[PDB]
Structures are given as structure tokens and as C-alpha cells.
Design an enzyme around this catalytic site. Structure first.
Site, PDB file in Angstrom:
ATOM      1  N   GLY A 172      10.192   4.879   3.662  1.00 23.36           N
ATOM      2  CA  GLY A 172      10.096   3.652   3.505  1.00 23.36           C
ATOM      3  C   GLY A 172       8.974   3.096   2.543  1.00 23.36           C
ATOM      4  CB  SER A 173       7.787   0.150   0.631  1.00 22.91           C
ATOM      5  OG  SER A 173       8.803  -0.853   1.237  1.00 22.91           O
ATOM      6  CB  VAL A 232      -0.769  -0.007   1.283  1.00 23.73           C
ATOM      7  CG1 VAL A 232      -1.857   1.235   1.167  1.00 23.73           C
ATOM      8  CG2 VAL A 232      -1.936  -1.137   1.261  1.00 23.73           C
ATOM      9  N   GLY A 233       1.728   1.357  -0.946  1.00 22.48           N
ATOM     10  CA  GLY A 233       2.628   2.390  -0.930  1.00 22.48           C
ATOM     11  C   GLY A 233       4.446   2.112  -0.668  1.00 22.48           C
ATOM     12  CB  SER A 234       7.111   2.100  -2.557  1.00 20.72           C
ATOM     13  OG  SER A 234       8.132   1.705  -2.340  1.00 20.72           O
ATOM     14  CG  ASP A 266       3.126  11.420   7.682  1.00 20.77           C
ATOM     15  OD1 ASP A 266       4.472  11.425   7.336  1.00 20.77           O
ATOM     16  OD2 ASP A 266       2.592  12.171   7.005  1.00 20.77           O
TER      17      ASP A 266
END
Length: 324
Positions: free
Chosen positions: A29-30, A26-28, A157
């Protein structure tokens, strides 16, 4: 003891305790979404990218781990787990952070007044906590605000929403930079449109000043630079417009709160603790259920250490981790 780990690829090799199943990127950290079999929770598992590549990466890794460990509040994302497949500091190369998997963000007819109250309330309750730890978010925006089904909200975040003091180059920075951002979010929730949709920082400041007024002499007494003062007092002099006329049919207490948040002078802007007590949140306000944080030691921020020391400090924090 040490859990059993398994590995798979999806495009680095992830090595995670076996309690985390059905990893799907779910996205890329990753980040992979996962199922935590221990709790039956959906979780995000973030594998830090290159966490000790340089002194700057290592210190950012430490800063991220420390911050997440500190946050213990319903409306603020905290740490559910941190692990590494390393059995000692020598093999320690990889850090994984596990947090609640949150559905939607606030990029999201329009909302009812009751529901805007509830969402802003939650944001302010979270901010009261963060701020009481002497942490400033600095970049609050609808995409950093996550919500579940029951639209319980968590702050994530840590330039349409950024305080003008930042877009001017002033450096009298309050924690109330975040209260400006909440004011812009609330306005967007109330009217469906971005309050200050600037094309560049100049366009943005123009829109801001059109609404709030050009700085008054009292705020002007706080600007230390001659050119900076010269700049502001060169701009065409705008009067404070009426907020009601921008927020048509909004609950009038919403409008009153907005006028307290969207104040150019940061020393006069309402704080999170004060906003929560405002009449607009009557139905949700509980002054005995709005907890504050332990003091947060950011002294590390000024320190100039070696990669191996930031690394070891990070390892100390991994080992000492205790779940909620």
C-alpha cells in the site's frame, strides 16, 4: 449511515471520510498521516495497493484485515477504522485501513536498566496476548516496535533478530521464535550494539553458536535429517560462553533472563507468560493485568478460493467492523 467522503491526489486519488483531515504522505500500500477530527488522534491511513489483483493479493488483503480486527490489546497495534468509498460489493475495489500514528520505532548514550525493563515488559505483555491467539509474529525486530512520547510500546505489522532454527532449515517452530527475537532486542538495548550482526546466514549462525554453545546431544536427538545433523556436528565445537562477560555491568537479573531467552533449543526457551513473571520485571508485573486473546481462526489459511470469494469475504469484514 455512510460518512461524507472527499477526494484528493498525492500519486493515487484518495477518497476518505471527511473526518480524516490533513493527509500527508508517509510512505509507499501507501500510507498517509492524518488528523482524525472525531477523536483528535493522529492516525495512519493505509490505502491497500492492488488488493484484489489476483487470488494471492485478495487472500493477503483478507488475512491483513482479519488479523488487525482481532487484535485488541494496549501493546499491539489494532484497527481504528476500515472503509471503502464503495456503496456495494460491485463497486468494491479499494480498502483503507486506519491505525494509530506512532512516532519513533525502537531503532533508537544507551538506555537505563529501568527503561529497558519497561520496554521489554511491554513487548512481552503484547507477545503474551498474540501468542495466546496462536499467532506467531516471526519477524520481531526494533523497526516493528513503535513507541509514543511516554514510550508506551505497540507491536507492529507482523535477519539479525530471527531464531536460528529458522536460519538452519529446522521446522520444529515454537511461538518462542519470537522470544529469541526479544532476547536479541533486549541485548541491543542493554549494550548499544547489535548482538548478532551477521553478514550472511552462515556468519550469523557462527556468531550465535559462539555465544550459546554448539547443540548438545539432547537437541541433536531432535534433528531428523542426516546431512543437517552432519552439518552441525561438523562445525568446530564451541562451549557456551559466559553471558555476564558479554553483558558487563548489566543488572544480573537481565543477564539471567537473557540466558533463558537465548537458548538454542526452542522447547527449553522461556515463554512470554513465564518471562513476565521473572524477577527482572518485579516493578511492572501484574498478573491480573496481562490479558489473553480470544481464539483466532486461521483455518482460512489452508483454503483455495476464487478471487471473488476472498473479495466478498473481505467486504463482509469491512461492513461488520465496529470501532473500539
Amino acid at each position: 449511515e455512510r460518512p461524507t467522503f472527499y477526494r484528493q491526489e498525492l500519486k493515487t486519488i484518495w477518497e476518505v471520510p471527511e473526518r480524516y483531515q490533513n493527509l500527508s504522505p508517509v510512505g509507499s500500500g501507501s500510507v498517509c498521516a492524518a488528523f482524525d477530527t472525531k477523536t483528535g488522534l493522529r492516525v495512519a491511513v493505509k490505502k491497500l495497493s492492488r488488493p484484489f489483483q489476483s487470488i494471492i493479493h485478495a487472500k493477503r488483503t483478507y488475512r491483513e484485515l482479519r488479523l488487525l480486527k482481532h487484535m485488541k490489546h494496549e501493546n499491539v497495534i489494532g484497527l481504528l477504522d476500515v472503509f471503502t468509498p464503495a456503496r456495494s460489493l460491485e463497486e468494491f475495489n479499494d480498502v483503507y485501513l486506519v491505525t494509530h500514528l506512532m512516532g519513533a520505532d525502537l531503532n533508537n548514550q544507551k538506555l537505563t536498566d529501568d527503561h529497558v525493563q519497561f520496554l521489554i515488559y511491554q513487548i512481552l505483555r503484547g507477545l503474551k496476548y498474540i501468542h495466546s491467539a496462536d499467532i506467531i509474529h516471526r519477524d520481531l525486530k526494533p523497526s516493528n516496535l513503535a513507541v509514543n512520547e511516554d514510550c508506551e510500546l505497540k507491536i507492529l505489522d507482523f535477519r539479525w533478530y530471527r531464531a536460528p532454527e529458522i536460519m538452519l532449515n529446522w521446522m520444529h517452530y515454537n511461538q518462542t521464535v519470537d522470544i529469541w527475537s526479544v532476547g536479541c532486542i533486549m541485548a541491543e538495548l542493554l549494550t548499544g550494539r547489535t548482538l548478532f550482526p551477521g553478514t550472511d546466514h552462515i556468519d550469523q549462525l557462527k556468531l550465535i553458536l559462539r555465544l550459546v554453545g554448539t547443540p548438545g546431544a539432547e537437541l541433536l536427538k531432535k534433528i531428523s535429517s542426516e546431512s543437517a545433523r552432519n552439518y552441525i556436528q561438523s562445525l568446530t565445537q564451541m562451549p557456551k560462553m559466559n553471558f555476564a562477560n558479554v553483558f558487563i555491568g548489566a543488572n544480573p537479573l537481565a543477564v539471567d533472563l537473557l540466558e533463558k531467552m537465548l537458548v538454542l533449543d526452542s522447547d527449553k526457551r522461556i515463554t512470554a507468560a513465564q518471562a513476565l513473571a521473572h524477577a527482572y520485571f518485579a516493578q511492572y508485573h501484574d498478573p491480573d493485568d496481562e490479558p489473553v486473546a480470544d481464539p483466532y481462526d486461521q483455518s482460512f489459511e489452508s483454503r483455495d478460493l476464487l478471487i471473488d470469494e476472498w473479495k466478498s469475504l473481505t467486504y463482509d469484514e469491512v461492513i461488520s467492523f465496529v470501532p473500539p
